[PDB]
Design a protein around this ligand. Structure first.
Ligand SMILES: NC(=O)c1ccc[n+]([C@@H]2O[C@H](COP(=O)([O-])OP(=O)(O)OC[C@H]3O[C@@H](n4cnc5c(N)ncnc54)[C@H](O)[C@@H]3O)[C@@H](O)[C@H]2O)c1
Ligand SMILES: [Cl-]
Ligand SMILES: [Zn+2]
Lengths: 42, 318
């Protein structure tokens, strides 16, 4: 698949967005813990 | 609970920038010192809303340190030798932090002094930090010390020192370092995991981490294993080659040379641990417990390496 956020395809576990979108472990876990989407550089 | 104001220095640095992005994102106000305003990273940070920047050098500049901690409740401090004597700067920062009186948690990024664990020399950009750690402890600041592992992103095919994942003519990759090819070393994905982890530490508070030393590394791989990771991630053959010295293929500043030569002796000759401290001699346990969404070398290898290369100016990935 592919994270809707960081677009990574490599991750130890796929999670989901309250809407149904697939997020990687980091992005999914981050949003759940802090409330906002995991920010990326650039 | 409440999002507090965080004081950071060396804002363009990888550890700090990682913390700043996630911190500003979740609602924390950031006050950070940057050497220069010009630059990609610099410009980016400037763009982030609740990020107030203070441009100026740290060395013998207490007025800047005072401003930085004004109204600051938290602080993540990681200095770079390039700015000058890290001991004098690290001590002035701690002084200002306490002098401010609102710091409830001062996270100082430290590094070992190898001469205190073996006949090994003191890695010049590492040892100084251990001294500042002692000075922080001495002032009574509610603190926590994090020891960063080797960055996944130091890697580049470009001719930069110590971590060049060079592109051979035959389309293969070769990495030349003094490190023993089989000795597992502590790695860390700075841009991906420093921020989340630091947030967790702040959220946990000094009530749990005060005075603690934490190894900021989420996985330990050997030079050969790191090579394995890159290989089964790029479809190409990557090999490690232990070389007695660091190949300086470009004009690097003096201070940075001294650093490498020391690295050659510690890791090349003596094969000493990265973290020679008894508490660190799994070391990755605490980090993973603080943040479960870390990025290993394989993901870095497959998802970031290609991307950073292209942007840097390379097309072997095309
Ligand atoms: N690379 C690693 O794997 C690793 C591992 C553990 C610890 N460390 C420690 O990290 C520290 C560096 O922190 P970082 O990784 O967050 O930063 P960094 O290496 O990512 O970059 C620091 C940035 O700050 C700029 N800068 C700071 N002071 C400057 C000055 N006086 N003149 C010009 N530029 C200046 C640099 O040019 C650069 O853009 C070092 O002290 C190092 O020993 C690095
Ligand atoms: Cl900076
Ligand atoms: Zn993701």
């Amino acid at each position: 698949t592919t994270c809707t956020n960081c677009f990574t395809q490599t991750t130890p576990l796929w999670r989901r967005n309250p809407e149904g979108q697939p997020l990687c472990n980091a992005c999914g876990l981050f949003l759940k813990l802090h409330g906002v989407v995991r920010p990326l550089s650039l | 609970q409440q999002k507090k104001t965080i004081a950071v220095v060396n804002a363009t640095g990888r550890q700090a920038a990682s913390l700043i992005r996630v911190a500003a994102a979740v609602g924390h106000h950031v006050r950070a010192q940057v050497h220069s305003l010009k630059g990609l990273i610099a410009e980016e940070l400037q763009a982030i809303p609740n990020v107030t920047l203070f441009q100026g050098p740290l060395l013998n500049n207490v007025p800047l340190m005072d401003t930085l901690f004004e109204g600051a409740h938290l602080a993540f401090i990681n200095t770079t030798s390039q700015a000058g004597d890290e001991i004098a700067i690290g001590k002035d920062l701690a002084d200002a932090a306490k002098r401010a009186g609102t710091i409830q948690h001062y996270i100082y990024s430290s590094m070992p002094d190898h001469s205190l664990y073996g006949p090994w020399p003191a890695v010049p950009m590492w040892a100084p930090k251990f001294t500042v750690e002692n000075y922080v402890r001495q002032l009574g600041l509610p603190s926590t010390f994090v020891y960063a592992g080797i960055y996944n992103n130091n890697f580049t095919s470009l001719p930069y020192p110590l971590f060049q994942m060079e592109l051979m003519p035959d389309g293969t990759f070769e990495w030349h370092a003094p490190f023993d090819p089989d000795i597992p070393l502590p790695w860390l994905d700075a841009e991906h995991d420093v921020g989340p982890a630091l947030l967790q530490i702040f959220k946990d508070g000094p009530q749990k981490w005060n005075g603690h030393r934490i190894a900021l590394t989420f996985e330990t791989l050997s030079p050969v294993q790191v090579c394995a990771a890159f290989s089964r991630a790029l479809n190409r053959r990557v090999t490690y080659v232990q070389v007695p010295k660091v190949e300086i293929k470009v004009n690097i500043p003096v201070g940075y040379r001294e650093q490498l030569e020391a690295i050659e002796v510690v890791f090349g000759e003596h094969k000493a641990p990265y973290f020679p401290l008894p508490e660190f001699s799994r070391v990755t346990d605490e980090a993973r417990k603080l943040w479960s969404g870390w990025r290993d070398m394989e993901e870095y290898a497959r998802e970031v390496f290609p991307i950073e290369e292209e942007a840097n100016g390379l097309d072997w990935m095309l």
